[PDB]
Amino acid sequence: ILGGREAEAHARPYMASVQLNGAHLCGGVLVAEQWVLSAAHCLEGKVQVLLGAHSLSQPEPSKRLYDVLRAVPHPDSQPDTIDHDLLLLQLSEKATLGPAVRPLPWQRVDRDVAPGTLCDVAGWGIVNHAGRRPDSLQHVLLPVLDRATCNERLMCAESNRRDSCKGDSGGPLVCGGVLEGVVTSGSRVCGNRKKPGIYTRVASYAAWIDSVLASA
Ligand SMILES: NC(=O)n1cc(NC(=O)N2C[C@@H](N)C[C@H]2C(=O)Nc2cccc(OC(F)(F)F)c2)c2ccccc21
Question: Where are the active-site residues found?
Answer without folding.
Answer: 41, 85, 169
